Amino acid sequence: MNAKFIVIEGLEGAGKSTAIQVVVETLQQNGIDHITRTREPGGTLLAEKLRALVKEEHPGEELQDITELLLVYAARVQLVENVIKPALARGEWVVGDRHDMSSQAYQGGGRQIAPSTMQSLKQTALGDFKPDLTLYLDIDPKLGLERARGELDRIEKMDISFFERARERYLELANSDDSVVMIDAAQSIEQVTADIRRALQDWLSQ
Amino acid sequence: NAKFIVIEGLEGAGKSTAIQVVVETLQQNGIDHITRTREPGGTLLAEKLRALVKEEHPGEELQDITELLLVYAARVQLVENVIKPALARGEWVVGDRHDMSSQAYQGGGRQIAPSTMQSLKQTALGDFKPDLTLYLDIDPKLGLERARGRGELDRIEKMDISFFERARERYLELANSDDSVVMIDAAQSIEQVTADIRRALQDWLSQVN
Ligand SMILES: Cc1cn([C@H]2C[C@@H](O)[C@H](CO)O2)c(=O)[nH]c1=O
Numbered sequence A: 001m002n003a004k005f006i007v008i009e010g011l012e013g014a015g016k017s018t019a020i021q022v023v024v025e026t027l028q029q030n031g032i033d034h035i036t037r038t039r040e041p042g043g044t045l046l047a048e049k050l051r052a053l054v055k056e057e058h059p060g061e062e063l064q065d066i067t068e069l070l071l072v073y074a075a076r077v078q079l080v081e082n083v084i085k086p087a088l089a090r091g092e093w094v095v096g097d098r099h100d101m102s103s104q105a106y107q108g109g110g111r112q113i114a115p116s117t118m119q120s121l122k123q124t125a126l127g128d129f130k131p132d133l134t135l136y137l138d139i140d141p142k143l144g145l146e147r148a149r150g151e152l153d154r155i156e157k158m159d160i161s162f163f164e165r166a167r168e169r170y171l172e173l174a175n176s177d178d179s180v181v182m183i184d185a186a187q188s189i190e191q192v193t194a195d196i197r198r199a200l201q202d203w204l205s206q
Numbered sequence B: 001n002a003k004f005i006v007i008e009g010l011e012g013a014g015k016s017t018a019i020q021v022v023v024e025t026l027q028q029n030g031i032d033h034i035t036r037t038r039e040p041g042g043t044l045l046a047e048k049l050r051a052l053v054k055e056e057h058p059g060e061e062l063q064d065i066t067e068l069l070l071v072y073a074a075r076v077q078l079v080e081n082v083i084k085p086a087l088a089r090g091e092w093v094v095g096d097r098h099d100m101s102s103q104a105y106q107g108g109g110r111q112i113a114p115s116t117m118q119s120l121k122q123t124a125l126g127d128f129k130p131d132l133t134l135y136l137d138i139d140p141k142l143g144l145e146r147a148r149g150r151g152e153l154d155r156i157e158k159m160d161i162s163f164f165e166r167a168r169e170r171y172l173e174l175a176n177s178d179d180s181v182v183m184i185d186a187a188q189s190i191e192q193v194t195a196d197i198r199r200a201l202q203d204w205l206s207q208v209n
């Protein structure tokens, strides 16, 4: 095995942090002890500042959808170039909390930004770079918002249909991509854990 | 018919005082309401983006593509919330830098290819463009010696000389191939600069109808 980038995806409330930890422990049980964890938007000083700009409301100013996409991308470029690519080049595996699949679902599906725009901006910012394995934790939008309880950011204040379109695109990508495996996240902790731990052990042996 | 006039040039070419000349000239020809803008900036979010772009970043390297995406992010905000709405109200707009700056600095300076610049331009701004542009040309060295007189130099103002040479070189190609861009010599004196701006501007106003 050589180093890989594994991404956890899904709506908020899908138990992403449980999944991250499951993924990490699996790799450890498999003799992989050098692992880097990341989150997006974020993971660098500047990326974290961009995350805060994206999650806040701006007074006397409408945050345009394209702006939103440009910002998540600017944060993505920083992470990929300063943290992710160098870790992989050194033989360190990277486990991330969201990556580009989130822009496709949130900005593509949710904001309804033209797919052609999505495609060319992904091209300019990332070229060909892509995760090696993504675990998309799928959950019903209302169930998910009601598990995220315990303050709603600018995106989390959007109406339900927004999350439904995000979900639909997440589903279109998950079925059309063999490097994406779907996990039913509305099960109990023992079971989400079993399916993640089983889809990854599985994937590794391949 | 509201117009959007942009003043361009390397930093230190004398942009702030050229906008004044432009503003006063428009005021003599009976143009009542004018909005002033600068880029990146001009909105609370745009200003925060300006600081991120102008500031250093010990801890990490700021990639050229990130820089490009941040100036366009600042631009989309300004254009959509301030320029277009002001133009719709019958107001003229005079801005300190616009897209030509991304072409000179990110395209020429950073050497990002024209097709990348051109597709990000389409994605962010569509076919929106200023009606007139005054490019104040100046020798790069002289440009930086003047900037220093205002205050400390930003991340970008600290690049080696060739960066500014490539940007100037790009501004000149653009000034030459575009009929809506007119070049002013900033090597001249304050009177001479003021006078060419006033005349170039004067001509353009008549040659409209
Ligand atoms: C990474 C990413 C996150 N988001 C949203 C979902 C919010 O919960 C998230 C904050 O992590 O910002 C996007 O809209 N697009 C993206 O590309």
Ligand SMILES: Cc1cn([C@H]2C[C@@H](O)[C@H](CO)O2)c(=O)[nH]c1=O
Pocket: B011, B039, B040, B053, B054, B071, B097, B098, B099, B101, B102, B103, B105, B106, B154, B156, B157
């Ligand atoms: C508007 C704009 C400014 N800049 C530069 C000029 C100044 O505002 C600041 C420092 O040179 O950023 C760019 O590099 N690209 C741009 O598109």
Ligand SMILES: [Cl-]
Pocket: A011, A012, A013, A014, A015, A016, A017
């Ligand atoms: Cl979660």
Ligand SMILES: [Cl-]
Pocket: B009, B010, B011, B012, B013, B014, B015, B016
């Ligand atoms: Cl200047």
